[PDB]
RNA sequence: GGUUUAGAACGUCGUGAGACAGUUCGGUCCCUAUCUGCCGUGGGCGCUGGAGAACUGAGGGGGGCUGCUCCUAGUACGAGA
């Protein structure tokens, strides 16, 4: 039946504010995983969760696109989880975008900056996890 | 090439020879550099015995232009762009 129990699922969500580094995380998340080769950046476009082309010029994430992996803890790269992450954007613009993805997910890593701390962006988002009380860590 | 010479025409003016910041076609542009000047290149004499070399360097001339991309750096600035 299905591929895995469910103690394998990891459901994360990445939001942060503004260039924090939410895409250049996942994309190495998903390097260190496997499913992509060549690490690739943002300010050049190539990364692939960025494809509206609107992000591949502008170089922001726009909107939300879960991503799936097989990274693992026990004996790690050996026994492998299932972790879903949502890189969601986190302009105050499109914080309808955290919005619904912040209710959909069961934790979510938050991603701070070690030049500034937190930044207005973060204290929304930081209401926006309070709002459903979505368990989370942080990522400087 | 044009402007303004001789040929020619149109419009216009003049009765006319002709004329017009009106137009159109055609229409010869000379000079062996003496001096000054400047580019170089020498011959004489000096420089205090003659000669051969190497120099120092007064002073003068040449050369001084820049773009793009990358890195620093998506850094500082900025809520974000
Ligand atoms: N120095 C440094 N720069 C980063 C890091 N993460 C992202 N960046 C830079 O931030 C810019 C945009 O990153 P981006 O993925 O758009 O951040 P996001 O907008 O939060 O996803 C790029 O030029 C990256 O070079 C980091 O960990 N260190």
Request: with cysteine; aromatic share 8%; glycine share 8%.
């Amino acid at each position: 039946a299905r591929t895995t129990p469910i103690a394998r699922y990891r459901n994360i969500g990445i939001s942060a504010h503004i260039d924090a580094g939410k895409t250049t995380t996942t994309e190495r998340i998903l390097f260190y995983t496997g499913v992509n080769h060549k690490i690739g950046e943002v300010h050049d476009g190539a990364a692939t969760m960025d494809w509206m082309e609107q992000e591949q010029e502008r170089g922001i994430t726009i909107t939300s696109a879960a991503t799936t992996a097989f990274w693992s803890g026990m004996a790690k790269q050996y026994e492998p989880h299932r972790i879903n992450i949502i890189d969601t954007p986190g302009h105050v613009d499109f914080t309808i975008e955290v919005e619904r993805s912040m209710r959909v997910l069961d934790g979510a890593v938050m991603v701070y900056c070690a030049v500034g701390g937190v930044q207005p962006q973060s204290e929304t988002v930081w209401r926006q996890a309070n709002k459903y009380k979505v368990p989370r860590i942080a990522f400087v």
